[PDB]
């Protein structure tokens, strides 16, 4: 029975590891890659222009062991910007494989 405090500690560790990776990983081959980023939910690598990018369900989720095959998706546009949801600047994301 997974508690809030356990989940916060795992999230902090996921964030810490993500931030190290963002800092440490070498720069993309061109500025047309979408920028790696931690969006509070998942750690995203650089994205090739015109491509979908996927990462595994974030491991700190309370139900992570119930979604061991799932992935979350972004789309990197040809201009090096993550695709945005309309009438906002929030990124488009498909998290449906990582729901409870």
């Amino acid at each position: 029975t997974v508690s809030l405090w356990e989940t916060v500690q795992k999230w902090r560790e996921y964030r810490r590891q993500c931030q190290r990776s963002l800092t440490e990983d070498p720069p993309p081959a061109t500025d047309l890659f979408c920028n790696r980023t931690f969006d509070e939910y998942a750690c995203w690598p650089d994205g090739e222009p015109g491509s979908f990018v996927n990462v595994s369900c974030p491991w700190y989720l309370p139900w992570a062991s119930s979604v061991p095959q799932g992935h979350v998706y972004r789309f990197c546009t040809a201009e090096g910007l993550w695709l945005q949801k309309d009438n906002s600047s929030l990124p488009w994301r498909d998290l449906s494989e990582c729901e409870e």
């Binding site: 029975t1 809030l4 969006d39 939910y41």
Partner: peptide
């Protein structure tokens, strides 16, 4: 013996919900 019909289920559900609402807070922004 009915699952979800006991006070222990309600208390476990409430604690699980604290963590799930934290997740939903992270997803939003």
């Amino acid at each position: 013996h009915x699952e979800g019909x006991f006070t222990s289920d309600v208390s476990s559900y409430l604690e699980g919900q604290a963590a799930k609402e934290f997740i939903a807070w992270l997803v939003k922004g």
